[PDB]
Nucleic acid binder design. Structure first.
Ligand SMILES: [K+]
Ligand SMILES: [K+]
Ligand SMILES: [K+]
Ligand SMILES: [K+]
Ligand SMILES: [K+]
Ligand SMILES: [K+]
Ligand SMILES: [K+]
Ligand SMILES: [K+]
Ligand SMILES: [K+]
Ligand SMILES: [K+]
Ligand SMILES: [K+]
Ligand SMILES: [K+]
Ligand SMILES: [K+]
Ligand SMILES: [K+]
Ligand SMILES: [K+]
Ligand SMILES: [Mg+2]
Ligand SMILES: [Mg+2]
Ligand SMILES: [Mg+2]
Ligand SMILES: [Mg+2]
Ligand SMILES: [Mg+2]
Ligand SMILES: [Mg+2]
Ligand SMILES: [Mg+2]
Ligand SMILES: [Mg+2]
Ligand SMILES: [Mg+2]
Ligand SMILES: [Mg+2]
Ligand SMILES: [Mg+2]
Ligand SMILES: [Mg+2]
Ligand SMILES: [Mg+2]
Ligand SMILES: [Mg+2]
Ligand SMILES: [Mg+2]
Ligand SMILES: [Mg+2]
Ligand SMILES: [Mg+2]
Ligand SMILES: [Mg+2]
Ligand SMILES: [Mg+2]
Ligand SMILES: [Mg+2]
Ligand SMILES: [Mg+2]
Ligand SMILES: [Mg+2]
Ligand SMILES: [Mg+2]
Ligand SMILES: [Mg+2]
Ligand SMILES: [Mg+2]
Ligand SMILES: [Mg+2]
Ligand SMILES: [Mg+2]
Ligand SMILES: [Mg+2]
Ligand SMILES: [Mg+2]
Ligand SMILES: [Mg+2]
Ligand SMILES: [Mg+2]
Ligand SMILES: [Mg+2]
Ligand SMILES: [Mg+2]
Ligand SMILES: [Mg+2]
Ligand SMILES: [Mg+2]
Ligand SMILES: [Mg+2]
Ligand SMILES: [Mg+2]
Ligand SMILES: [Mg+2]
Ligand SMILES: [Mg+2]
Ligand SMILES: [Mg+2]
Ligand SMILES: [Mg+2]
Ligand SMILES: [Mg+2]
Ligand SMILES: [Mg+2]
Ligand SMILES: [Mg+2]
Ligand SMILES: [Mg+2]
Ligand SMILES: [Mg+2]
Ligand SMILES: [Mg+2]
Ligand SMILES: [Mg+2]
Ligand SMILES: [Mg+2]
Ligand SMILES: [Mg+2]
Ligand SMILES: [Mg+2]
Ligand SMILES: [Mg+2]
Ligand SMILES: [Mg+2]
Ligand SMILES: [Mg+2]
Ligand SMILES: [Mg+2]
Ligand SMILES: [Mg+2]
Ligand SMILES: [Mg+2]
Ligand SMILES: [Mg+2]
Ligand SMILES: [Mg+2]
Ligand SMILES: [Mg+2]
Ligand SMILES: [Mg+2]
Ligand SMILES: [Mg+2]
Ligand SMILES: [Mg+2]
Ligand SMILES: [Mg+2]
Ligand SMILES: [Mg+2]
Ligand SMILES: [Mg+2]
Ligand SMILES: [Mg+2]
Ligand SMILES: [Mg+2]
Ligand SMILES: [Mg+2]
Ligand SMILES: [Mg+2]
Ligand SMILES: [Mg+2]
Ligand SMILES: [Mg+2]
Ligand SMILES: [Mg+2]
Ligand SMILES: [Mg+2]
Ligand SMILES: [Mg+2]
Ligand SMILES: [Mg+2]
Ligand SMILES: [Mg+2]
Ligand SMILES: [Zn+2]
Lengths: 208, 99, 104, 124, 138, 83
RNA sequence: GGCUAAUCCCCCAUGUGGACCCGCCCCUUGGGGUGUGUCCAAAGGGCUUUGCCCGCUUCCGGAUGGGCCCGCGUCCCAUCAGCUAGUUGGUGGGGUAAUGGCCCACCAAGGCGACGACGGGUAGCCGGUCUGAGAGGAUGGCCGGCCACAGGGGCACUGAGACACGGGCCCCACUCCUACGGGAGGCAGCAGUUAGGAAUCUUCCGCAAUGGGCGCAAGCCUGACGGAGCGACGCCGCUUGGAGGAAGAAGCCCUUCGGGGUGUAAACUCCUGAACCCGGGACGAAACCCCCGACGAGGGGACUGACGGUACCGGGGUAAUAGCGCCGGCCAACUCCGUGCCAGCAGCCGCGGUAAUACGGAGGGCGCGAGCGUUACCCGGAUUCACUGGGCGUAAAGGGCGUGUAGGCGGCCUGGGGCGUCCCAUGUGAAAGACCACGGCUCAACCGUGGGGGAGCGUGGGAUACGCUCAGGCUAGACG
RNA sequence: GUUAA
RNA sequence: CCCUACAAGG
């Protein structure tokens, strides 16, 4: 299945702060706070000039770890984006952003993307009224992602939505805190995201 | 073992016999007529020729010699007779060839 | 439409039959170069009307014999023994290619 | 060459020879060990490389390498060949698969175990 | 005897322009003249004109070139940077209208001889016809 | 004789038939003479039965014999209604 | 040997019509009409029984299916160059539904081949599939189309149709049964056994649905089919947890012995609940039939589910599989010990000779994850058979030189034709697949509906610059 | 005599 | 085990 392993070691490797724990990744301790260098016995030893290949591979491993997708699905999305009209780079992020588990994260129903995934798998989520437990379900403009009724009481869902009060949400989304429901307005524009990723390098990685 | 539809084989055997016997009568008469025409025996020849014709068409009523196959025979037959006779005699009985 | 081909008569040594040589040129499927290929058809000439050297039209027809499914439609022009000659020499040439050749 | 020459002779599709006559181009082939020898490598190298002479079901009798430190093959050991030559042993173009037939998997192997045919040891 | 009077002309031009001659003569022929018409029209050459060299008909082709240049090798850029025969004796090249090439995204041209006369690739595309792809220039 | 019947085109546990005009002797999912409608037995779409009524009428008029089920569907689509 | 029925067989009649000979007309290969002569039909059964249903006869036409013929296209070897007697054509017969040396009689001496005959090798061919920027290369499993075969070879009978996989006859090999004379048999149907092999499944359920055969119908048959089973064989979706958590347990690895690493990882707290357990419980199935109506239209009624108590719903509910390859360069990822050209690694370059980032183990790391590797094969990269898109002075490559045959190629001007070439219209280009859109299974895979395609070939019409061909002229090439 | 630096 | 990691020599 998914990764399921030490995640702050991934941030360290990528030399950038990836938010894979939601909270704590804000505390004085995402480790990127103390030891923002690679994990392992040689983590501090002087680094060596990376090969053009290495750069792409990492930038890609970076953009993929952020969403927590397998290389299998990641590449499939990438291929779908290549076939599609318009800048592959953005469209790819467009699709990545459209993953339900992800949308749940962008609306705050869950503090992390992994948590969002569990929230979906365990059926505490719903698209257009119907239950949907597929983390990879593709959300379309107009859909309404909401917390399932039966679960509008989970202590966890309270907190997350309580904290959502007075918090802004992505320009391409809309959140109704009281009704624990959100809506996917439009596909995010590349300029709408602030990803520490240079999607081009990723495209290049696959041209090889 | 034992597909009772070997009844098809039985039947085929009889049909075979029925067909076989019809065709022989046909060949035999046809030969007989062409043989008489080739001798000038006009009336006698035409007489038989019609039998052949009748037997051939009758044969065409069922599987035996069904078809244009019948026509082909009548044709070839009414052809050799008239030709053989013209090479001498006159169409007496005229019981088949048209004026 | 029954096919109608145009060709020269390169043989009348058969009763009621003429060998019609037919050419056709066209772009080579890979190299482009307009190449030129030909074939011989045994055509029916009941009246023995057509002579060696005639450029006649040939037309698809109900089989007259094995190897023979075309009838001579008409004469297009004649006395073109130059064409027959080419064919004949090409053939003559051949008998000088194996262990049974001779003329240079 | 001119286009005319190309029309007259065209190009020649050249085919490649197999580096592995394991007949049927089967991915593997079974056989019996005829001889279990030892062989010396070429020039740069020196050592007592382990090789086996195998009589194949494909009707061939070729020499195959016996990878790994272990090895329990004798003059009648039935085994599976796979193809993969040995840069050092001219003539050796196939490898014997360890862990199949009479070929024991390398024991105590703890790393590239799936090659060498070695099952996973209990960890605690 | 030449085997490709057209190729001959494209080359006489190519060779001359390469040494910055003012003009160059080519054995005369209508078809050749027609090609020259386009080169002129297209501004690849100043123009041309019939002339009689030792009694026989030729075609003075007046060549064009850019301005003198800077640094080392002040030789001027060429107007006719590339002039290449496509169709040739024993490899004629024919194209349908949907197969007429676009030379250098339009910056260059193609010259086909159609049953509507010799045309630039645009003129051909316009009149909706294809033909023999004579050469290319830019 | 020539027939009007159903050809299977769904997928496991998801049938989708094509109402077809095919020679009786041909395999059911084989080469048919002409498609003339479609049928979704599970009505998983408001569009679960369509029939080129005129085309059907044409074939019936030339001898096409409809399968009992083919005939049911054909009727539901008004092929036999007179008025 | 005897008896007997019919929708079995035959004779006679009727002749709508049709078949055949001859004639004439139209048309043009044997197409249609017409006249005389001749020849040719038939079956009955059911009842809601004076009139309907099923069916039979002849003919014309429709529809579907098919036979035969022709143009073009269809692998390797020229270390296969000459092949041919039913051979090539004729006349007249035979045969067929039908043309034809398909077969025969007789006559003629022809037919084929370097544009590759003949011989040899290999191979079912397509729609497509894989790859590739394309051109192209490779391929033809699943599905759809065509062909061919049914233990090997030959053969015909029956029939609308076969020269017939579960029909027949003969020869051969083999198996079995024999009282030894003589018989029976053919899974390349489904499943299963065995042999060969690196390797390929259940002697399953059902006929409910779709489709087929027979029947007026009821209905019977259907290993076709619709399903279930087995195999990560492939593809897609899912899990093995989520949040908190120390300047950071222990163990283990490094160390300059200060400390660094595994690492928020664990422990532990809290939250959610794969599995499982209950209750409900499908769609796929509405016809045939029956009643009304007119056995029509239309309207009512009844029967029917293998999958399966499955999918899916609702309730309850446990923190609950991770492996494999790799880490000298190519190529992402480094240290310690062991070993000492040994043991061994290795795709290519190469590595091991006593401090090895390359061997073997360990710690750490990189990659991918119910997979990961390996081997084999195909395309790619390989413009490395070069059409797109290569070359030959010294790298592999100019023939030792000439003469000249076929072939390829061809100066300037005018005219005819319109073969090449170009243009328009139109027919064909099955479905599936591919592409786009939308839609159905919670997504996806999978699937449905719709849209758009073109080359090629046919047909009609058009153009004439170039190439071609014919005709005329020229003198710059050539020759004299 | 071999293989290395 | 002497040479230099070996082969060959003692
Ligand atoms: K009459
Ligand atoms: K009919
Ligand atoms: K036909
Ligand atoms: K004949
Ligand atoms: K092929
Ligand atoms: K192909
Ligand atoms: K009714
Ligand atoms: K539940
Ligand atoms: K746990
Ligand atoms: K040591
Ligand atoms: K190591
Ligand atoms: K390759
Ligand atoms: K030489
Ligand atoms: K020589
Ligand atoms: K002209
Ligand atoms: Mg794109
Ligand atoms: Mg029976
Ligand atoms: Mg007799
Ligand atoms: Mg003659
Ligand atoms: Mg003949
Ligand atoms: Mg080529
Ligand atoms: Mg050796
Ligand atoms: Mg070495
Ligand atoms: Mg290998
Ligand atoms: Mg040139
Ligand atoms: Mg140029
Ligand atoms: Mg008796
Ligand atoms: Mg009676
Ligand atoms: Mg009867
Ligand atoms: Mg009458
Ligand atoms: Mg009458
Ligand atoms: Mg006529
Ligand atoms: Mg008539
Ligand atoms: Mg009449
Ligand atoms: Mg009668
Ligand atoms: Mg004949
Ligand atoms: Mg005949
Ligand atoms: Mg013959
Ligand atoms: Mg030829
Ligand atoms: Mg051959
Ligand atoms: Mg074969
Ligand atoms: Mg390429
Ligand atoms: Mg198929
Ligand atoms: Mg056979
Ligand atoms: Mg067998
Ligand atoms: Mg047999
Ligand atoms: Mg046989
Ligand atoms: Mg018969
Ligand atoms: Mg048979
Ligand atoms: Mg059988
Ligand atoms: Mg075995
Ligand atoms: Mg199965
Ligand atoms: Mg059934
Ligand atoms: Mg049925
Ligand atoms: Mg049965
Ligand atoms: Mg099945
Ligand atoms: Mg398998
Ligand atoms: Mg945790
Ligand atoms: Mg239940
Ligand atoms: Mg229903
Ligand atoms: Mg149901
Ligand atoms: Mg029923
Ligand atoms: Mg009633
Ligand atoms: Mg009704
Ligand atoms: Mg609980
Ligand atoms: Mg590296
Ligand atoms: Mg050692
Ligand atoms: Mg290794
Ligand atoms: Mg390595
Ligand atoms: Mg998976
Ligand atoms: Mg290539
Ligand atoms: Mg090569
Ligand atoms: Mg080239
Ligand atoms: Mg080269
Ligand atoms: Mg040299
Ligand atoms: Mg050389
Ligand atoms: Mg020389
Ligand atoms: Mg010459
Ligand atoms: Mg010329
Ligand atoms: Mg010429
Ligand atoms: Mg033309
Ligand atoms: Mg099409
Ligand atoms: Mg078209
Ligand atoms: Mg299609
Ligand atoms: Mg959908
Ligand atoms: Mg479609
Ligand atoms: Mg046309
Ligand atoms: Mg002309
Ligand atoms: Mg002239
Ligand atoms: Mg003069
Ligand atoms: Mg020595
Ligand atoms: Mg060495
Ligand atoms: Zn973090």
């Amino acid at each position: 299945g998914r990764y399921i392993g030490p995640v702050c070691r991934l941030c360290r490797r990528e030399g950038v702060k990836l938010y894979l724990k939601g909270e704590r990744c804000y505390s004085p301790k995402c480790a990127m706070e103390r030891r923002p260098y690679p994990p392992g016995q040689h983590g501090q030893k002087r680094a060596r000039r990376p090969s053009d290949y290495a750069v792409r591979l990492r930038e890609k491993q970076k953009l993929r770890r952020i969403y927590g997708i397998s290389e299998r699905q990641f590449r499939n999305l990438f291929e779908e984006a290549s076939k599609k009209k318009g800048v592959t780079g953005s469209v790819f992020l467009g699709l990545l952003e459209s993953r339900l588990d992800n949308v749940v994260y962008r609306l705050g129903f869950a503090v992390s993307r992994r948590q969002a995934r569990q929230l979906v798998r365990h059926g505490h989520i719903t698209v257009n009224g119907r239950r949907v437990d597929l983390p990879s379900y593709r959300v379309r403009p107009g859909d309404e992602i909401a917390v399932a009724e039966k679960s509008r009481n989970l202590e966890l869902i309270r907190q997350n939505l309580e904290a959502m009060k007075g918090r802004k949400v992505g320009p391409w989304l809309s959140l109704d805190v009281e009704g624990m429901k959100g809506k996917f307005l439009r596909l995010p524009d590349r300029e709408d995201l602030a990803l520490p990723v240079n999607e081009q390098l990723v495209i290049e990685f696959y041209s090889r | 073992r034992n597909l009772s539809a070997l009844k098809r084989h039985r039947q085929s055997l009889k049909r075979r016999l029925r067909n076989k016997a019809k065709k022989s009568a046909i060949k035999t008469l046809s030969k007989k007529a062409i043989q008489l025409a080739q001798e000038g025996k006009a009336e006698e020849a035409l007489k038989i020729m019609r039998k052949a014709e009748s037997l051939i068409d009758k044969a065409a009523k069922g599987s035996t010699l069904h078809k244009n196959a019948a026509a082909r025979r009548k044709s070839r037959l009414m052809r050799k007779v008239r030709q053989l006779l013209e090479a001498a005699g006159a169409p007496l009985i005229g019981g088949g060839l048209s004026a | 439409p029954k096919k109608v081909l145009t060709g020269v008569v390169v043989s009348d040594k058969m009763q009621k039959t003429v060998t019609v040589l037919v050419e056709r040129q066209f772009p080579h499927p890979l190299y482009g170069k307009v190449i030129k290929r030909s074939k011989k058809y045994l055509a029916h000439d009941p009246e023995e009307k057509y002579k060696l050297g005639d450029v006649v039209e040939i037309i698809e027809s109900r089989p007259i014999s094995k190897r023979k499914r075309f009838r001579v439609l008409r004469l297009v022009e004649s006395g073109r023994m130059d064409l027959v000659e080419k064919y004949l020499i090409r053939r003559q040439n051949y008998e000088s290619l194996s262990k049974r050749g001779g003329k240079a | 060459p001119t286009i005319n020459q190309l029309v007259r002779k065209g190009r020649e599709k050249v085919r490649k020879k197999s580096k592995v006559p394991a007949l049927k181009g089967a991915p593997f082939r079974r056989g019996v060990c005829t001889v279990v020898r030892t062989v010396t490598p070429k020039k740069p190298n020196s050592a007592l490389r382990k090789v086996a002479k195998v009589r194949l079901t494909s009707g061939y009798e070729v020499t195959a390498y016996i990878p790994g430190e272990g090895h329990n093959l004798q003059e009648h050991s039935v085994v599976l060949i796979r193809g993969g030559r040995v840069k050092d042993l001219p003539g050796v173009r196939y490898h014997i698969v360890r862990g199949v037939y009479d070929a024991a998997g390398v024991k105590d192997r703890k790393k590239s175990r799936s090659k060498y045919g070695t099952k996973k040891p209990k960890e605690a | 005897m030449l085997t490709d009077p057209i190729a001959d002309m494209l080359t006489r031009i190519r060779n001359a322009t390469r040494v910055y001659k003012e003009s160059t003569d080519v054995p005369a022929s209508r078809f050749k003249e027609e090609i020259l018409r386009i080169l002129a029209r297209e501004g690849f050459i100043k123009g041309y004109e019939r002339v009689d060299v030792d009694g026989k008909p030729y075609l003075r082709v007046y060549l064009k070139y850019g301005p003198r240049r800077q640094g080392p090798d002040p030789r001027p850029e060429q107007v006719i940077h590339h002039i290449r025969r496509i169709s040739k004796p024993g490899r004629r090249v024919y194209v349908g209208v949907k197969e007429i090439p676009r030379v250098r995204r339009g910056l260059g041209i193609a010259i086909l001889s159609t049953s509507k006369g010799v045309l630039t690739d645009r003129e051909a595309r316009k009149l909706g016809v294809g033909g023999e792809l004579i050469c290319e220039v830019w | 004789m020539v027939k009007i019947r159903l050809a299977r085109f769904g997928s496991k546990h998801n049938p989708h038939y094509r109402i077809v005009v095919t020679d009786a002797r041909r395999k059911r999912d084989g080469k048919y003479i002409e498609k003339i409608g479609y049928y979704d037995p599970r009505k998983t779409t408001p569009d679960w039965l369509k029939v080129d009524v005129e085309r059907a009428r044409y074939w019936l008029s030339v001898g096409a014999q409809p399968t009992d089920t083919a005939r049911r569907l054909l009727r539901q689509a008004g092929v036999f209604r007179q008025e």
